[PDB]
Structure formats: structure tokens, C-alpha cells
Design a protein around this ligand. Sequence first.
Ligand SMILES: Nc1nc2c(ncn2[C@@H]2O[C@H](COP(=O)(O)OP(=O)(O)O)[C@@H](O)[C@H]2O)c(=O)[nH]1
Ligand SMILES: [Mg+2]
Ligand SMILES: [Mg+2]
Ligand SMILES: [Mg+2]
Ligand SMILES: [Mg+2]
Ligand SMILES: [Mg+2]
Ligand SMILES: [Mg+2]
Ligand SMILES: [Mg+2]
Ligand SMILES: [Mg+2]
Ligand SMILES: [Mg+2]
Ligand SMILES: [Mg+2]
Ligand SMILES: [Mg+2]
Ligand SMILES: [Mg+2]
Ligand SMILES: [Mg+2]
Ligand SMILES: [Mg+2]
Ligand SMILES: [Mg+2]
Ligand SMILES: [Mg+2]
Ligand SMILES: [Mg+2]
Ligand SMILES: [Mg+2]
Lengths: 401, 122, 136, 96, 161
Amino acid sequence: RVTPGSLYKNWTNTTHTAQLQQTAVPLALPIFNFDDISKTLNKVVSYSNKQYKSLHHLGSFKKSQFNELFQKPVCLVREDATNSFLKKLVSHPVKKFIITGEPGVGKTVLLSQAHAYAVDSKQIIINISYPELFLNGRNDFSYDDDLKLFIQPMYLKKLIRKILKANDPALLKSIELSKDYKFSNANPKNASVKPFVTLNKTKNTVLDLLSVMTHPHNRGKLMKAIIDELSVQSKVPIMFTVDNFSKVLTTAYSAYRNTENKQIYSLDLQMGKLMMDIISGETKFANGESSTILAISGVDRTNKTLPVALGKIPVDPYVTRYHYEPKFVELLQKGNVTEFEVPKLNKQEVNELIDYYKQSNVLLDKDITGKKWENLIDEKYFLSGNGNPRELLKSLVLSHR
Amino acid sequence: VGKRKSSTAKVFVVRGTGEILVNGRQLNDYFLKMKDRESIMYPLQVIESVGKYNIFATTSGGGPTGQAESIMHAIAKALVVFNPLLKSRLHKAGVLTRDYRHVERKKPGKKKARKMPTWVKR
Amino acid sequence: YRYTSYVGEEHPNSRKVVLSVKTKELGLEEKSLHKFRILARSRYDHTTDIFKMSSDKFEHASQNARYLHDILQRLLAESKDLTEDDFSDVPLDTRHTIAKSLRKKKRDYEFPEHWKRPEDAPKKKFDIVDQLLSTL
Amino acid sequence: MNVPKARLLKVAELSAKIFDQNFNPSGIRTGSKILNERLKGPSVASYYGNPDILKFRHLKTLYPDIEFVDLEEQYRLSMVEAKKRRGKGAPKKMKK
Amino acid sequence: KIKPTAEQLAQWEALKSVPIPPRKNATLDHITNMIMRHGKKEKAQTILSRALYLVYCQTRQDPIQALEKSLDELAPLMMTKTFNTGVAKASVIPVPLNKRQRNRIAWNWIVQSANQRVSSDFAVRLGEELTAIAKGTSSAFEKRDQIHKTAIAHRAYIQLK
RNA sequence: AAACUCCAUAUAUAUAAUUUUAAUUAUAUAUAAUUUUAUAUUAUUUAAUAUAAAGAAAGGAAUUAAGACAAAUCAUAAUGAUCCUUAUAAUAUGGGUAAUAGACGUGCUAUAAUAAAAUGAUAAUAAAAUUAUAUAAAAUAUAUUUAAUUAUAUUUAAUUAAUAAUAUAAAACAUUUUAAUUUUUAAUAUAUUUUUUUAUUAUAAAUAUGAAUUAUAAUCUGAAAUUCGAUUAUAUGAAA
Ligand SMILES: Nc1nc2c(ncn2[C@@H]2O[C@H](COP(=O)(O)OP(=O)(O)O)[C@@H](O)[C@H]2O)c(=O)[nH]1
Ligand SMILES: [Mg+2]
Ligand SMILES: [Mg+2]
Ligand SMILES: [Mg+2]
Ligand SMILES: [Mg+2]
Ligand SMILES: [Mg+2]
Ligand SMILES: [Mg+2]
Ligand SMILES: [Mg+2]
Ligand SMILES: [Mg+2]
Ligand SMILES: [Mg+2]
Ligand SMILES: [Mg+2]
Ligand SMILES: [Mg+2]
Ligand SMILES: [Mg+2]
Ligand SMILES: [Mg+2]
Ligand SMILES: [Mg+2]
Ligand SMILES: [Mg+2]
Ligand SMILES: [Mg+2]
Ligand SMILES: [Mg+2]
Ligand SMILES: [Mg+2]
């Protein structure tokens, strides 16, 4: 008893997935570029078209945000938060960050900005938004024999596709291969004719490698090969990113069960192990400017692990595996992860946001009409808990109290 | 010091730019319900002085909404010292009144305070 | 050694005696101190560096006190041994203390020092008759 | 628990040796909780009262000079006498 | 001796003209209370505000105001209240309605019409219904019209007149 | 009857070397209101409404008279009369009070998405009360490959108590999931909705509700758990 047009989903899903961004005012806002941050240092800025294209593919813009409020997802540049982070990324020798903060402070937004910057500066981006998919057991998996770990060839395929599409092909096909690669063919065409697909050293490309389509049991092998290729190449920078890395840290054991009924460890998987290797000084990328940018989510569980990894708490040895996994900490220490605290909004920034919202026509009538502007701003600041952006946004729009 | 239900809120209000700290942590972190935050703000909102006064609240006892109400009550009293002419206005707004609403005890024969067990005729 | 006595009554808690010492105040070297603390286990609190223990096993209070003393002496002897038993590589178990802390409440938070306004404080108001009076 | 198990066990054993408390690493039913329970008998016995309490009988022993009267007893005796009089006295008890 | 300072006096004067701000939008609060069941007001509030957000998204104009307008439209200005009438014919009379009663009648109808919509989440259903009413389509309107017609019959049954 | 009374409230004073700390408290002693004042608008100097300024000022408990109902109690206990005195008095071992056609009250749990379940350790937020016929912390072991949870066992740290324990309150709020529901899934492509979209293929009246009833295995208390107790596990999964 359902039509195509009617809304059948729950609220959060509906807001994400039903395009109510359709009925919205076009806004001629400035464009996000790191080279011209001096112009737009503390102003709202729409992303470039190319950036948007890349960012959507990656999975930067998420469901629980209020990206439905505008024509397209929008951020502002911040001197204390985003700009400083970008500068650190540019300058630091290690280039290896974990974006920490309170729930709703704007970690994902920071990640999205970092991605956009990377896109601008001719870099490949391997984004893993929501590791919950590979960590929790809701897709097929298999123990590979060559690689001593469990591969996940539904998730992997999706990730490969994202990598292919998020990045431009000219940058991606500038990379020649280091080794030759045999794979099992899995086209609808040439199934009987071509039993195997072969990629040569100099002739073939990374783009071509990505476009390969194998059976599930070779997908993990393909992924491994791709990563190796990217590590080897020194022509283009590789930005690796993992958002909701908190889940990964806490969920040490996956929901998958091996032959004997017991839970599989995250490092015994392909994806989680690979990710950990990337984080640590192990799969070292040949080029400079090649970063790993991790991000915590307030959604996920909290425990002693991440604080212990960083310069926060001394290592209590007696706390349990559930609330403190030491292997993960050790791995984090190995690859010198310098954490980045996202600061809460200043008064001026809050004011600027409120002004933008007013321009876009999100503010309620009781806020605008018959009220001093400065007083309103102060109230908004108070209700957000002194500049938590999400909370502020909620107070503005989702209050109706 | 303000009170409501079982809650008690000792609140240090000071002239610095308007930031909040409830019980040694951020306001949005402590009070999750926006209503409680709005209530807390209200003494500063009846005056045009939200943003003017720094507030350091310290609560104990009761639940969250009651705690927030006790904080609000305390803040109004604190404000009254800064400018005595606004005291009447605050009273009119309904912030200077200590909300007496006290939880009624369970009486013997009754199940709860008022809720009696079912009656029968036959 | 704290002793308790119920005056008119004959309580069975009058026998209870409680020894209690700060572990740093005990005459020990650093290695031996750590070993002593390890041996104490739940009896040693780490936030306050205090080790206490009570005995109710024996009939009289004096007996119980003597027993506690003997235990303490034994503990000290063990701490000062060091022959084929150091306990350098067993970290201090602080689980009981954290459990106790959780059970209780905390008021660790304080008023921010940079939020203070000495300039806004009420200055001394000039009372002329009081000044006149003060001839001493 | 990165710290080893055997060392912890040894430490626990040592602690047990130091104090009087026993060291049961295997976790077997020893029977310790049966004996170690404080015996509650004297308190239980002392429930109804002190059986040696002064009675009316004694108020003759202590003070022979004062001719006391137990009123309830006297009443009972009077009732018995009345019963005897009106043919409602107790029947004579069988011996066999 | 009171001794009020100049700045304080100026502040008081500035305040004096401004009226005391209201702590709640009353009609909204009433609605939230009606939605609410087991002293779980927060959940009811979340539901209501989410619905209003959805409404706004669908049609970009103040959601609260639109809701109030809808209530005003829908709320029947009077009701044909039944009476025993001294043990005789149950002679009905038109009776004027308090604001709350008016909006209460409207809300129940709105809820009913929402419950016919598809989604699992009630908040979504509610929002869709509110948007439909804003645009101008419901059986609630028809019911109101019918009520008004029934009130119109029994003109002079009103006692004081 | 009201009032004095108790609880709770507001204020003041006293005391607490602010390690028995919660001073945001506890407890003795006061004071405080069955609130006051004024301007008007109706009805006749007053009384209800409204407005204003002054106040923290707003409840609950106990107390339920005379008479009556030959209301209830001789099974709390006692006493009158009457009846039993090798028995209608007294002690032990077992059984019964828990029997089951229909019926009648009180409750509890339910019949799923404005509502259920997983999770949430710099442990979100209480109060009141108990612990020498005790309260039992941490930790080890087994159920259970990690560990947590829950349940037992092992063994008693602390305190007979503003000091330790019962006891990290729970809803809340947040992520995840949820059949009925082809209102979803997964194979392909697809893309500026990517924890997602579109296209084309295949996905065909009690559940992934409920927890009655029963089977087996363990555990707990006790000397003893068959009639007849309480847990846990693996199955069973009515009715609604
Ligand atoms: N920094 C920043 N954040 C914003 C901006 N606009 C919205 N946000 C908010 O940033 C939030 C993302 O915070 P995040 O740290 O991902 O929340 P978490 O997932 O709970 O950790 C969203 O909820 C947005 O509402 C902006 O312009 N800048
Ligand atoms: Mg996130
Ligand atoms: Mg009276
Ligand atoms: Mg204190
Ligand atoms: Mg009477
Ligand atoms: Mg009778
Ligand atoms: Mg009678
Ligand atoms: Mg009798
Ligand atoms: Mg009798
Ligand atoms: Mg007998
Ligand atoms: Mg019975
Ligand atoms: Mg009854
Ligand atoms: Mg349910
Ligand atoms: Mg324990
Ligand atoms: Mg305690
Ligand atoms: Mg908890
Ligand atoms: Mg049925
Ligand atoms: Mg079930
Ligand atoms: Mg259930």
C-alpha cells in the first residue's frame, strides 16, 4: 500500500534520502580553496563542483547532519578549527592526524574540508566513512589462503568503486604499475573466452587495475595489489581517511564467526588489518604529502584505549580488554598520531552562521521579527553550550518549543 | 543557592562574557534536553543580560529537569544582587519564586499518594 | 590503633581494634615499600597513601590489637626480605579504590581562575564616624 | 590483564600467608563458610527473657514480715471455691 | 540608604519599556502535552519538532505559524453539546469553545489523518499531514464543515441569545 | 470544627578544626502568613472580580465527635457463663492448609514501530533506608575464546556506620536492529541523496511479538525441597 512519491522511511532516513533539498533558495556563496583562505577566512563557503562530486562519492556528507536545509552541503572556514588543521597538515613531517572533540563539534565537516583540499591539490583519496559496515557482520566474508586474513568481498567492491569514482581519472591513470597482475575474470562478456585478466608492468595503469572485476575470492587479492601500487607510487599524494574510527578502536572483535563458534578479531580481517597497517609506520607511502586523517564519532562507544594512545592518561594495566585494548594503542604509538582537538565555535562565528541561516531562510519568525540581533545570538550561544554547532543548529531549527 | 524537588544548586554568577559551566562540565553535555537549558537561560532572558554574565553552576541531588530549575532559581537570586531594581521584574517573570511542588508521600491504604486500590460494591 | 568502648552496654564491637598507618611514614626503602603495598592489596588505598586493617577474631580488644601488631610486623619483615622475591614487575592494583570512588560522589570541579573579577568586587566604603572613634 | 597470571597467584598466596586468611587457587568447596559463620545460639536463647526473675513466691522468702497478697491468684482461688460450691468443680483426675 | 548607581538605573530604565518575554509558545506546548503519554514529554517534543522541521522542508515558510493557521482553520468555533433537558427530548445546543478546546478538536482529527499515512515513524506521518493541511486537503475540514452545519441547525436553541 | 502538632518551605543564630564532609550539608533554637496593601468595576460601611507592589510564601500527614449498625474480633490478649479433665489437655513422625467441574473478586504479564530489544568505564542524573540472630567489596574459577554482561562457586577487604558495604539508580538522551511490509534484501550497472539514489533481474492472519506449558542438566537455602521452595542453562514456544 505504498507509492513511489510517498515517504515510507523513518524521520532521519527520510531527511537524508527524500530530496527536500529540492525546494531551497539558490545561494551565490564563495568557493572553498586553501590557496585563497585569506579572502574567505571566517565566512560560509559552498564547495566547488568537482569537490562536491568527489566528496559525495567518498561519503563525506552524512545523514544526521542538516545538509537538507540548503541547496547543497555547506561549511564555513574557521581560523581556530579548520584553517589551523590544514596548516598543520601542510607543514608537519609525519602528516598523521586523529580529529577529536565533543559530539556534534564538527569532525566530519573537518574531514570533508580536508578531502576538498586534497581534491584541489591533485591528490587521491581513499575514504572509509563508517567502518561499522566492514566491522559489524552484515555482508559476505571468506578466509583467503594466500593472505592470512578474512576478506569481505561485498564491502571491498564498493570501496574500490568509491575510489574509482571519487578521484579524477587523469591523476589516477598517471601511475604505471610496479608489478604484473593476474586476476580471475568476471565480466558478462568474455567469460568463456578470457578466463583470466592480465595487467602488465609499464603498459597497464592503476585506473585499469581498479576497473578489474573478479570473483569474490580474488577481490581481496585485487585490493591488496591496489594498496601496494599506491604505496609504491611517488607521483601523486594519497590521502587515507577513516571517519567513526572510534567504533574501530572499541569494536576490537567483529561479529563474524570462524569455523569454530567464536568471534573473529578485527586485525584478523582484511580491511581492519589493512587500515591498521596504513595508520602505523608499515605500509609507508613513497610520496610526501600522503596523509592519514582519522575521525572520532560521539555516536560510538568511549573507553580507555584512545586516551591511552594519546598523551592523556597513564597506562593502567589492570583494566579489561573490553575497556582497554593495548595492541591498538601500540599500533597508534608506532605511527606517530598527533591528535587534533576541534574547538567549539566563537561568538563571532556563531553570529556569522546565524546570519547565513537567515539569508538562506531557515530562521523562524519568532527569532527574526521583534527581537534584537545581538541578544538572539547570545541566546543561541547559551543554548548551544557556548558554540556546539550541531546543538546550535538544533536550537535554531528543530526546537519548536 | 536554589532548590527544587530534591535538587540543590549553588551558582557563582560573575560579570565576564556569557559562558556556562554546570557541575564542572559544558552545558550541552550536562543538560541534554533543550527545555532545561532554556529554563536556565530564562532569568538572563527576562533581563537583557544573557551574554553579559558568566555562570558557574554546581548542582547536587534530584534529577536533570529539577536540577536545571534549581540552577535557574539560583541564577535569578544571583542577578538580583547585581542590580536590585530588576528584582521586582524577576519576581513578576516567576523566577524569584521558589517552586514548592514537593513529592507527596505514599499514604498507607492507598497504592501511591492519591491512587487508591480498586473499589467493589458486590 | 583506634579502640572503641560502649559505656553502659556490653557490645561485641568493643573488641574491635583498628590499626591504620600512612605507608610513606613507615621506615622502608622504595623497593620494599612497593612490595609491602602489593602484599596489603585491598587494605592499601593509593589516593591517600594509607594502609589500615581491623581484627575482630579474638575475644578481647587487647588481644585483637596484639594480633594486628603481629600481622604488621610480619608484613614489614616480608617487605624487607628481597631475597629471590622483589615484586618489581607487578603493578599496583587500584581496582578496589576506583570501585570505592565510584560508590561515593566527587566535587573535584572548581571556579575558573580566569573568570574572576577583583575589579568588580565591592570596595571598602568610607565610614567617617567609625574612623573618628578609632583613636587607639 | 597484560600482567602475568602466575606472578599474581604467587602474590595472592604470599598475602594469604602474611595474614591468617586461606589461599584457595583451584576454587574448590572447602567448607570454610560452614565453620567461619558466627554462632548465634546465646542470642536466640535469650529471646523470651531472664528466667531467674523475682516472683511473688520469693514478692515470702526475702521479706517474711510483710504479709503480701497476690491478687490474681486469690481471685482464681475464689473462682475455684465458687465452682466447687455450685457443682461445677473439676472432676477428680484418673490415675491408673 | 539604598544607593543605586547610574549605570544600573539606566539599565533598569531600558528594561522598563520591554515586556517580560514568554517562556513557552502556549498552543505548541498544549499540543506537545496532548501527544505525550507517560510523563515522557521529551519524546513528544522531539516528535512534534521533527514533524515541524519536515513540514518546513516540504514548504519553506515558518512551520509553527503554518500549524497555528491550520488549527485556526480546522478548529470548529462551536459545538452542538447534548443535554438531558429535564427528562424530555435531548435538545442539543450550540456552545462556544475555549481556544484549547478548539485546537484540541483539530489536533485529534490531524492525528487520525496522519495515522492513515504510510511510514513507521509517527513523526513523519504527522509532518506529512501538517503539510497537506497547509496546502489545503483533509477530511478534517469536511468534518468541521459538517459540525458547523449541525450548529447552524438549532439557531435559537441557545438560551440567553 | 478551627488553632496549637508533625513533615516540607524561607530567613536568622549556634555547632562541625570543611579527612565521619554532603557546608550545594545536618540539627538544635527562634522568626515567618488562616498573608498584606492600594487603584478601579459591579452590587450593597463592606464583598466578589480585575489590575498593580510587597513577599520564599504553594502543599501533605496526624487528628475522623455524639450516637447508631446487637457491624468486625472470645484465633493478639484477657474475663463472665458454659462444656472437656487418660482428654476437647501434652509430645513426636508423616500428611494437609498448595486438592480442582463451573463461578467470583483483586493483581501481574502480555497482544510490536507516537514501541520493543543490543550497546553506552575519564562510568549522565536521585532519594529514602538497612547492615553483632550481619551487609559482603574487590579479585579468581566455571557457564562462555577473547572481555563485558548475567548467574553461581572460591574468599572475606572494609563497617557494626554521616566514616565501609547493600548500590556505577532507571527511565532519559545517542547509535544499531526490528516481522507483519517486493515499505526489504543482493547481482549487475548507475551518480553532485554514496551509513544513500535510480534502472533491470531474482527475492511467494501469531513474528526476529508473547512467554504459558513441559523435558533434561546444573546451582541456592536448609538436617530435609516427593507431595511443596528459589535461581541459571539448553530445548519446549498455549492463549492472546
Ligand atoms: N565545523 C563546522 N561544523 C558544522 C558546520 N555546519 C554544521 N556543522 C555541524 O557539524 C556536525 C558534525 O559533527 P561530528 O563531530 O561529526 O559529530 P559526531 O558524528 O557525533 O562526532 C554536524 O552535526 C553539523 O550540524 C560548519 O560550518 N562548520
Ligand atoms: Mg561522525
Ligand atoms: Mg483540627
Ligand atoms: Mg562541603
Ligand atoms: Mg463517633
Ligand atoms: Mg452480632
Ligand atoms: Mg457488635
Ligand atoms: Mg472466653
Ligand atoms: Mg486464650
Ligand atoms: Mg491435646
Ligand atoms: Mg490460604
Ligand atoms: Mg485489597
Ligand atoms: Mg513490544
Ligand atoms: Mg565483586
Ligand atoms: Mg559508603
Ligand atoms: Mg550507569
Ligand atoms: Mg491466536
Ligand atoms: Mg520472546
Ligand atoms: Mg519481553
